[PDB]
Scaffold this motif. Sequence first.
Motif, PDB file in Angstrom:
ATOM      1  N   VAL A 109       0.823  -1.052  -0.142  1.00  0.00           N
ATOM      2  CA  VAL A 109      -0.090  -0.026   0.025  1.00  0.00           C
ATOM      3  C   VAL A 109       0.934   1.254   0.049  1.00  0.00           C
ATOM      4  N   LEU A 110       0.622   2.095  -0.760  1.00  0.00           N
ATOM      5  CA  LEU A 110       1.456   3.548  -0.833  1.00  0.00           C
ATOM      6  C   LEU A 110       0.496   4.459  -1.698  1.00  0.00           C
ATOM      7  N   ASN A 111       1.086   5.792  -1.819  1.00  0.00           N
ATOM      8  CA  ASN A 111       0.333   6.760  -2.446  1.00  0.00           C
ATOM      9  C   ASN A 111       0.753   7.050  -4.020  1.00  0.00           C
ATOM     10  N   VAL A 125      15.270  -9.332  -3.758  1.00  0.00           N
ATOM     11  CA  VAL A 125      15.730  -8.627  -5.089  1.00  0.00           C
ATOM     12  C   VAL A 125      14.460  -8.725  -5.981  1.00  0.00           C
ATOM     13  N   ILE A 126      14.110  -7.399  -6.752  1.00  0.00           N
ATOM     14  CA  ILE A 126      12.889  -7.722  -7.668  1.00  0.00           C
ATOM     15  C   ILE A 126      13.595  -7.841  -9.299  1.00  0.00           C
ATOM     16  N   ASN A 127      12.687  -8.625  -9.792  1.00  0.00           N
ATOM     17  CA  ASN A 127      12.912  -8.810 -11.442  1.00  0.00           C
ATOM     18  C   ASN A 127      11.591  -7.735 -12.039  1.00  0.00           C
ATOM     19  N   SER A 159      10.939  12.365   7.063  1.00  0.00           N
ATOM     20  CA  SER A 159      10.161  11.591   8.046  1.00  0.00           C
ATOM     21  C   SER A 159       9.335  10.652   7.212  1.00  0.00           C
ATOM     22  N   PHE A 160       9.771   9.441   6.780  1.00  0.00           N
ATOM     23  CA  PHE A 160       9.132   8.562   5.933  1.00  0.00           C
ATOM     24  C   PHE A 160       8.956   7.059   6.785  1.00  0.00           C
ATOM     25  N   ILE A 161       7.759   6.564   6.727  1.00  0.00           N
ATOM     26  CA  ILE A 161       7.748   5.166   7.314  1.00  0.00           C
ATOM     27  C   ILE A 161       6.922   4.356   6.168  1.00  0.00           C
ATOM     28  N   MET A 209       8.965  11.926  -5.718  1.00  0.00           N
ATOM     29  CA  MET A 209       7.957  11.004  -5.455  1.00  0.00           C
ATOM     30  C   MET A 209       8.708  10.031  -4.513  1.00  0.00           C
ATOM     31  N   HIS A 210       8.179   9.827  -3.291  1.00  0.00           N
ATOM     32  CA  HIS A 210       9.215   8.784  -2.390  1.00  0.00           C
ATOM     33  C   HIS A 210       9.258   7.390  -2.819  1.00  0.00           C
ATOM     34  N   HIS A 211      10.474   6.861  -2.636  1.00  0.00           N
ATOM     35  CA  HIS A 211      10.430   5.396  -2.934  1.00  0.00           C
ATOM     36  C   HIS A 211      11.337   4.757  -1.600  1.00  0.00           C
ATOM     37  N   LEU A 212      12.191   5.060  -1.150  1.00  0.00           N
ATOM     38  CA  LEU A 212      13.029   4.153  -0.070  1.00  0.00           C
ATOM     39  C   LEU A 212      13.746   4.977   0.688  1.00  0.00           C
ATOM     40  N   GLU A 213      14.452   4.176   1.830  1.00  0.00           N
ATOM     41  CA  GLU A 213      15.135   4.821   2.778  1.00  0.00           C
ATOM     42  C   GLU A 213      16.387   3.906   2.985  1.00  0.00           C
ATOM     43  N   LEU A 214      17.741   4.731   2.993  1.00  0.00           N
ATOM     44  CA  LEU A 214      18.645   3.840   2.851  1.00  0.00           C
ATOM     45  C   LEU A 214      19.136   3.493   4.419  1.00  0.00           C
ATOM     46  N   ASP A 247      15.771   1.196  -7.081  1.00  0.00           N
ATOM     47  CA  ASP A 247      14.523   0.669  -6.250  1.00  0.00           C
ATOM     48  C   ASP A 247      14.539  -0.763  -6.097  1.00  0.00           C
ATOM     49  N   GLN A 248      15.607  -1.414  -5.087  1.00  0.00           N
ATOM     50  CA  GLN A 248      15.812  -2.735  -4.741  1.00  0.00           C
ATOM     51  C   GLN A 248      16.361  -2.572  -3.161  1.00  0.00           C
ATOM     52  N   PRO A 249      16.046  -3.755  -2.519  1.00  0.00           N
ATOM     53  CA  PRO A 249      16.458  -3.814  -1.165  1.00  0.00           C
ATOM     54  C   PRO A 249      17.697  -4.246  -1.029  1.00  0.00           C
TER      55      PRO A 249
HETATM   56  C1  LIG Z   1       7.657   2.753   0.779  1.00  0.00           C
HETATM   57  O1  LIG Z   1       6.976   1.589   0.176  1.00  0.00           O
HETATM   58  C2  LIG Z   1       8.841   2.369   1.644  1.00  0.00           C
HETATM   59  C3  LIG Z   1       9.154   3.683   2.468  1.00  0.00           C
HETATM   60  C4  LIG Z   1      10.573   3.340   3.400  1.00  0.00           C
HETATM   61  C5  LIG Z   1       9.881   2.475   4.600  1.00  0.00           C
HETATM   62  C6  LIG Z   1      10.694   2.777   5.788  1.00  0.00           C
HETATM   63  N1  LIG Z   1      11.433   4.364   5.386  1.00  0.00           N
HETATM   64  C7  LIG Z   1      10.995   4.549   4.004  1.00  0.00           C
HETATM   65  O2  LIG Z   1      11.376   5.658   3.259  1.00  0.00           O
HETATM   66  N2  LIG Z   1       9.838   1.926   0.784  1.00  0.00           N
HETATM   67  C8  LIG Z   1      10.314   0.543   0.643  1.00  0.00           C
HETATM   68  O3  LIG Z   1       9.901  -0.426   1.637  1.00  0.00           O
HETATM   69  C9  LIG Z   1      11.744   0.279  -0.141  1.00  0.00           C
HETATM   70  C10 LIG Z   1      11.060  -0.784  -1.226  1.00  0.00           C
HETATM   71  C11 LIG Z   1      12.200  -1.155  -2.314  1.00  0.00           C
HETATM   72  C12 LIG Z   1      11.716  -2.125  -3.017  1.00  0.00           C
HETATM   73  C13 LIG Z   1      12.819   0.249  -2.900  1.00  0.00           C
HETATM   74  N3  LIG Z   1      12.478  -0.362   0.787  1.00  0.00           N
HETATM   75  C14 LIG Z   1      13.107   0.212   1.555  1.00  0.00           C
HETATM   76  O4  LIG Z   1      13.331   1.475   1.744  1.00  0.00           O
HETATM   77  C15 LIG Z   1      14.287  -0.426   2.327  1.00  0.00           C
HETATM   78  N4  LIG Z   1      15.652  -0.067   2.206  1.00  0.00           N
HETATM   79  C16 LIG Z   1      16.500  -0.786   1.566  1.00  0.00           C
HETATM   80  O5  LIG Z   1      16.287  -1.811   1.433  1.00  0.00           O
HETATM   81  C17 LIG Z   1      17.633   0.116   1.534  1.00  0.00           C
HETATM   82  F1  LIG Z   1      17.844   1.065   0.863  1.00  0.00           F
HETATM   83  F2  LIG Z   1      18.603  -0.692   0.811  1.00  0.00           F
HETATM   84  F3  LIG Z   1      18.522   0.281   2.762  1.00  0.00           F
HETATM   85  C18 LIG Z   1      13.868  -0.630   4.060  1.00  0.00           C
HETATM   86  C19 LIG Z   1      14.824  -1.322   4.728  1.00  0.00           C
HETATM   87  C20 LIG Z   1      12.316  -1.087   4.094  1.00  0.00           C
HETATM   88  C21 LIG Z   1      13.737   0.892   4.657  1.00  0.00           C
END
Ligand SMILES: *C(=O)[C@H](C[C@@H]1CCNC1=O)NC(=O)[C@H](CC(C)C)NC(=O)[C@@H](NC(=O)C(F)(F)F)C(C)(C)C
Lengths: 299, 299
Positions: free
Chosen positions: B26-28, B50-52, B138-140, B161-166, B186-188
Amino acid sequence: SGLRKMAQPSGLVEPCIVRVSYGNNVLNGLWLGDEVICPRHVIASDTTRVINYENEMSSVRLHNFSVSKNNVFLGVVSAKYKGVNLVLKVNQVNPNTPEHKFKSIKAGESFNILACYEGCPGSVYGVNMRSQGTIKGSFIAGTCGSVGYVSENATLYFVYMHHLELGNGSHVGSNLEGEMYGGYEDQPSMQLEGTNVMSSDNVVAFLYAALINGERWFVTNTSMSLESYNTWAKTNSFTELSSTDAFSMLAAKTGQSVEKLLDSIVRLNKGFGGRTILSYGSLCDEFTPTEVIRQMYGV
Amino acid sequence: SGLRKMAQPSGLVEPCIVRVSYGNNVLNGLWLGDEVICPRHVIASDTTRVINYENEMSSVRLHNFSVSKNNVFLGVVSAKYKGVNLVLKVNQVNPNTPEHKFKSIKAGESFNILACYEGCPGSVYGVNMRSQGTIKGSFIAGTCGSVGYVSENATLYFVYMHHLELGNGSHVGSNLEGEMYGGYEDQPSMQLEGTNVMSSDNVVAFLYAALINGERWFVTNTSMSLESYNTWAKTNSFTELSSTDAFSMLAAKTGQSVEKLLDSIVRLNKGFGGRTILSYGSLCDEFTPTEVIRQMYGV
Ligand SMILES: *C(=O)[C@H](C[C@@H]1CCNC1=O)NC(=O)[C@H](CC(C)C)NC(=O)[C@@H](NC(=O)C(F)(F)F)C(C)(C)C
Ligand SMILES: *C(=O)[C@H](C[C@@H]1CCNC1=O)NC(=O)[C@H](CC(C)C)NC(=O)[C@@H](NC(=O)C(F)(F)F)C(C)(C)C
């Protein structure tokens, strides 16, 4: 993760901001229904010297007001004081008046400022009411009548209207019934703030936010009982904590009890030893427990 | 007086936010015309591995999407990747689509985040692009697709547009063309942000702001030449300052030259020693010179 001081979105409030001018004075007003509320000092001949508001009212002329939303001007048909505000009746109902209530904010509570410049909403940011009825905001000439609001229960409350800045930079406004927070007068006269008392509830919430965000240097194998903390607080300008109940979920998620953080507060109020907490260099009481919980975990 | 990090008002952006889910994700999404743009990992069957993305697009079923806003459900008629974003054509046009453009933010530039929680705009706050293409927000979970925007000369730009947190907490997003800021995937995976380079222009603006606000403990009568500072900056992860011309007005209003502040930066870089500046406990590069000027003096 992250911690940032948030504002709740401004969309319902923005259409209510108007520009109000009188003489050479310009500020903002809140247009709801067919009424505009604004600070009464817009009619003062000289805001830099002590004002006789009875004489200013005696000499007022309705045709000397200018009221406008986005360069469309409204006819003013009545003017009254209500406390330290003017209430103006205008010749048009605001068609974008949101459903709303009026409420007053208490010490330690958070709300939102829509800072406006000469009738134009400019920016939005969160604040927290201090013990003495002031806020630390960011207001300059032209921003009186900027509006504070909070949304709870999906009910929109208007809670603040900006009037003045004290000599120490603290900001003073009224509620929308025209009672000035803190009892300050709307006069250019030296008024002293009084000792700021930190919200213990908010400082505990802050330290929990820090723990969640990976900051934990301030926690040690020491814990201070609630009554012991409350005795310290009485002579150190902190509020007394009524119970630790608000923190149960935060304690469970972080594994740190409130009493561990009460001991941190006592040690950190002495000084941080050159360290920081989330880039703060002293304790922060601007976040409430519910604010932190919502920001760290969602609604 | 005062300095807070602020956001521009959010009223034009709020009506464009929708909830987008697919499977467990679920996202926006950003709903403009008959299109909804959202991060493409919403269709990943497992965002923790890892996503294909080729396989995910081949298996997608449009009937698995839920797109909604208040009492409106939006049917997805087609789905396409555009860089790291999904572009969903939907069966209804957004009646509240604002006039808008798209542009990209550069390091050192400020913009606004509308933080959205599983479709619901929750908060608005200001950020600044870091050298490596990240922001500190501040993203969760549930906040991906939260939108960054900026308004210049009454033109609304969508920029983030927000995607991920390092792993170090830095936040990563894309522009609205689907190019990830900083180049992150956009990979873990193990992605390291790299060394943060502070914006010298912004830190100078920050110290001017403090001076204007009556804080002056950090300036001496000692100065440091633009050339000597730039040499220090190359070795100490600060940007080089092209000229002092951005600050001519600030130096005039404060009586302090940029060179006096350059020496402050070098001394403050090790830490504030138990003191604070505008309630920050270490140097802050999140405010541009223009930002400081408009907040403290008006347009
Ligand atoms: C939105 O779906 C979330 C936002 C994250 C959740 C925690 N803080 C945020 O900004 N994005 C993700 O869950 C994202 C999905 C990937 C497929 C892009 N994954 C992550 O942000 C992970 N980060 C990583 O794997 C990292 F960058 F390699 F560190 C976490 C571990 C869920 C934050
Ligand atoms: C709105 O008209 C301004 C807002 C002020 C301007 C600077 N920052 C603000 O928050 N209000 C005033 O100018 C106000 C008018 C009086 C009639 C209430 N006066 C002041 O805020 C003055 N403050 C004082 O005289 C003090 F409180 F005693 F310090 C200053 C000197 C203009 C700030």
